[PDB]
Design a protein around this nucleic acid. Structure first.
Lengths: 394, 153
RNA sequence: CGGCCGGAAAGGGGGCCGCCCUCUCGCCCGUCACGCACCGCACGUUCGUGGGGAACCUGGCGCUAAACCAUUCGUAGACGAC
RNA sequence: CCAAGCGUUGGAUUGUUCACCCACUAAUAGGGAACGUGAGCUGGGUUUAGACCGUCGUGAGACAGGUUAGUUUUACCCUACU
RNA sequence: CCUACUAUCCAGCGAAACCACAGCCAAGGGAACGGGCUUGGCGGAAUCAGCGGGGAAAGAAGACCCUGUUGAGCUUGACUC
RNA sequence: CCGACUUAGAACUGGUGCGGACCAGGGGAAUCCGACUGUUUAAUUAAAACAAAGCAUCGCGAAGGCCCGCGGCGGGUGUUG
RNA sequence: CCGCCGCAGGUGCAGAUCUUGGUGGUAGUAGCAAAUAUUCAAACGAGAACUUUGAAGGCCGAAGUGGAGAAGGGUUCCAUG
RNA sequence: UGGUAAGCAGAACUGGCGCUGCGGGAUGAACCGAACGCCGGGUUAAGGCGCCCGAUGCCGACGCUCAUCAGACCCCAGAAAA
RNA sequence: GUGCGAAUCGGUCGUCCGACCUGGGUAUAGGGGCGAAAGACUAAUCGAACCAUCUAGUAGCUGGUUCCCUCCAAAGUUUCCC
RNA sequence: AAAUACCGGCACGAGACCGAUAGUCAACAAGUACCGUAAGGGAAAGUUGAAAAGAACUUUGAAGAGAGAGUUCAAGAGGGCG
């Protein structure tokens, strides 16, 4: 007979192949739709999740009970050093889909980028792009390079550019840079490909791509949790205590006679390390890198307009399980997807943003840089010293 | 004795044999299949790595429940083990074989394992004691091993 | 024969000119004699320098790599895998 | 009328399915899947063996009367699913 | 969430129940509930950890019910002692 | 001169912790059943079932009452009244 | 050891949850998880996670994992290989 | 004949299945055609002849019908009043 | 729960000077014993132990019933019967 | 007394019988081993070769085991071996 009391499902069937995603870097499944009305720009970036902290700001949304008051928001710091362009890749609109037309690479590719085309870099001879790079040093080699462009503004329609990460600068173990196809949106195909060739072998900072108070979408693989059971994975009801074989499971896995087990029944397997795409993550501020002018290194990234003090966004003991944030960063609202150190694909919004919550203007009063390796009290080393006086070490 | 396959000519070959050898048949057949298309110095180096757990033996026919290792990808397979006693039992045989080669006056640095065959020997019975006053068999599964070498390159 | 111009939806072997190039034949009526005329007989005649593979020659022109194990890591993990 | 996309609850008494009442709520609609679902649980109810009461039987015993206590086994195979 | 012992991976040792053939589904007809048949869906080596929908899974010639001119324990106002 | 164990009280003290581990009763108002202790279906029922002391009838003065035995100048209660 | 003519029968197997013996798949699978705990060196040796000696760390904690008997066992006692 | 009716229970007559394959009904113990030693040629029955799938690939005849649930072959496999 | 075990293990529990617990010796024997009574116990056996013989007990009831070819080929109905 | 009976016992002779899952339970260290407290229950188990001529000696190994020699018609008969 029928279900006695109506309950919803446990979990979604929209994210159903709950397997380890074969990619470690977040693939952009859909780039934003362009119109040749706009000037040419990049539509995605490649950041590194450093960690999380507080913010204090005055909220401007009229009518609400939080209007003209202060709040405390969880913000996530993604360190984003400038990305290097190494190649352009053409696409043609085919009745079977959208086919890659012609790739053209740059002359000089840094070893950090070259590492991506290897598994065993130590055992290798670094011989990649030794005969491609020749094609810029020659007269006859040029006359393919030049006609490979003339063919691509004639036939090819969608133009994407091959950026890579400067892993040289980042405080991680790894040096093997991440390549990423970023779609060059904006004006017409001639204007677009003349731009992309000028920006070839150069760097793109984050101020070029993402502005301030811009609703972006973050693409990343989730944090892994290994082989989890049904009540750990699908979050079903636990069975009550007196159950012989096990109380941490689904009791009935289907009726008699649709005589197979359905795809919709909650089983045990891999939990976490899934490809996910959260939307509407509001950028609060883009910081600055560790500049050296006058000889004196300036590091006042987290200095707001109501502090005036020379504290970095690095809290006491840096970021836990990551390291020290020395490069230009983005700072979004709330939680984002995946572990500390995790490579994170920041993409422009698919939608239009015409709200109050979407066009809200941010004005950070305070950034918390108290230690996250314990219950921290002191913002700066000069606060802690001024409070606690001299010690025995002194 | 009557071997399975005659050597192509009885001047270039020496044979070695052992009956009622007390190893698992289903471990020795897999390690005797891995060793078959090898030069003898490669075989001694290989079985040594199987003893020290450095190269696996790919379990192909008798692979029921046999776990998955990273050293079975060089055989183009998924499942592999490091069977210590089977490696030790047809390494002693290799040493007896290259003893026979030296006595039969051959270039011992050139011998290739032409044919190697592991049969089942008669089982030996003993008893396990199970619930509700029952005795079940606990029988060993020993094996006959024979092999023929031949000098080449 | 070397260049002169095209081809992208699954690019396709072509058009055209000079010259380097050699005849005056080729197509159609009519004369002129010939070729195993294999002695009534079956798989004839093609696209075929087909496809796929082991190898042996004789010429040049060219190129000297990566994967896996082993080690390490811990954003990953039952084991593999990553 | 088109219309099954998403919902359709928390409790007192009863082994109950059903019933009835309290409270909440947009609403507290009805059903099927071997009267879904025991190598999934549970064992309150029924439905062995011990006993008590009432009615019937001369008796052994009977009750579509009430009551209390009463062992819930196995997956390492094939498929399905993860 | 934590701990111990397993499960798990390895060296050595190494059983058992069970088994016509075997093993992907929807509908049809059929001994009126098919793994095999008919018409359609369709179909890609070899495997590891799990799981309990299905094999009307295993176990024991139904302990209920009926029949048998088969019984046994008990009873009495049954028949014969 | 020689003492071996207690008990009561006070001052001070500790980050209010002190039977510091271990050892080690949860309580109350009632209803049903059986007085109580004891016993019971070894391997699914420990109970309200059996027993029990107390109460109450019945038989028999021995050649007898109750019971055993194939048998008997046979036997148990009975070394009894 | 067989052909032909007669003669005689314990005369022909797929099945009987048939009898006896033998072998498969499952399967190198279930498993080898009750009671805190092992470690460094040396010796003998062809060979040591397990023997033996030392050193350390531990458990039984006198209602013991200690020393002696009764019943039962029958040479299990002891040395050497 | 009894029963509201039943792939229900009980009769008469003849024919079938059981004991029996073969062609058709996609499929099927009983329907329709027709009963069988081992084969070649011919031709039929009952059914067919867009493709599965042998055969209408006829310059077939005459009408009827449009369905946002068309319709489409004994037994027979889903319908009425209005 | 193919166990440590053909009744065991853990915690928690009943009783613990008495109708207490227990070793040996000894008496009761199968329609018999013994029973503070559950048809309980009587050597893993009890609403009648175990062993051998009667005995190959009987079964209108299950299950099986062993070579080939040719020829013929049914019945499930009448009457009587614990 | 005689004529009659005799699956025990001592001794013989025979068979249209059985030929090691058969024939006695027993072709062998069989009423043996083993099981049961006991009464009782009760198996499995034949064959090297004509003759041990049963493989000296060399060689690998800790050894079981091999490799060569050697005996024999034959080890394609190597001690549980037609």
């Amino acid at each position: 007979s029928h279900r006695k009391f109506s309950a919803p499902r446990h979990g979604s069937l929209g994210f159903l192949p709950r397997k380890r995603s074969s990619r470690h870097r977040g693939k952009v499944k859909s780039f934003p739709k362009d119109d040749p009305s706009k000037p040419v720009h990049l539509t995605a970036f490649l950041g590194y999740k450093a960690g999380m902290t507080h913010i204090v700001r005055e909220v401007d949304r009229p009518g609400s009970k939080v209007n003209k008051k202060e709040v405390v928001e969880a913000v996530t710091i993604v360190e984003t050093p400038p990305m290097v362009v190494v190649g352009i890749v053409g696409y043609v609109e085919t009745p079977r889909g959208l086919r890659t037309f012609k790739t053209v690479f740059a002359e000089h590719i840094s070893d950090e980028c070259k590492r991506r085309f290897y598994k065993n870099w130590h055992k290798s001879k670094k011989k990649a792009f030794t005969k491609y790079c020749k094609k810029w040093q020659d007269d006859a080699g040029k006359r393919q390079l030049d006609k490979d462009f003339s063919s691509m503004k004639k036939y090819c329609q969608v133009i994407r550019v091959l950026a890579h990460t400067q892993m040289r600068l980042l405080p991680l173990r790894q040096k093997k840079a991440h390549l990423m196809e970023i779609q060059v949106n904006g004006g017409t195909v001639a204007e677009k490909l003349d731009w992309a060739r000028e920006r070839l072998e150069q760097q793109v900072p984050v101020s070029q791509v993402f502005g301030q108070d811009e609703m972006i979408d973050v693409i990343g693989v989730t944090k892994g949790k290994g082989y989890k059971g049904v009540t750990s994975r699908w979050h079903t009801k636990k069975l009550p205590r007196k159950t012989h074989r096990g109380l941490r499971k689904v009791a009935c896995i289907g009726a008699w006679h649709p005589a197979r087990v359905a795809f919709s029944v909650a089983r045990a397997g891999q939990k976490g390390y899934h490809h996910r795409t959260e939307i509407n993550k509001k950028i609060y501020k883009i910081g600055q890198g560790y500049l050296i002018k006058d000889g004196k290194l300036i590091k006042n990234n987290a200095s707001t307009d109501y502090d005036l003090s020379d504290k970095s966004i690095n809290p006491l003991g840096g970021f836990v399980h990551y390291g020290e944030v020395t490069n230009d960063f983005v700072m979004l609202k709330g939680c984002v997807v995946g572990t500390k150190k995790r490579v994170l694909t920041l993409r422009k919004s698919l939608l239009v943003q015409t709200k109050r919550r979407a066009l809200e203007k941010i004005d950070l009063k305070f950034i918390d840089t108290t230690s996250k390796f314990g219950h921290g009290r002191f913002q700066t080393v000069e606060e802690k010293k001024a409070f606690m006086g001299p010690l025995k070490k002194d | 004795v009557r071997y399975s396959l005659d050597p192509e000519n009885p001047t270039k070959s020496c044979k070695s044999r052992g009956s009622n050898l007390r190893v698992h048949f289903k471990n020795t057949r897999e390690t005797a299949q891995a060793i078959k298309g090898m030069h003898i110095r490669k075989a001694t180096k290989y079985l040594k790595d199987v003893t020290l757990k450095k190269q696996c033996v790919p379990f192909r026919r008798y692979n029921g429940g046999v776990g998955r290792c990273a050293q079975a990808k060089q055989w183009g397979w998924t499942q592999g083990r490091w069977p210590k006693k089977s490696a030790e039992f047809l390494l002693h045989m290799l040493k007896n074989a290259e003893s026979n080669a030296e006595l039969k006056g051959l270039d011992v640095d050139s011998l290739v394992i032409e044919h190697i065959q592991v049969n089942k020997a008669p089982k030996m019975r003993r008893r396990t004691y199970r619930a509700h006053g029952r005795i079940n068999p606990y029988m060993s599964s020993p094996c006959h091993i024979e092999m023929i070498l031949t000098e080449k390159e």
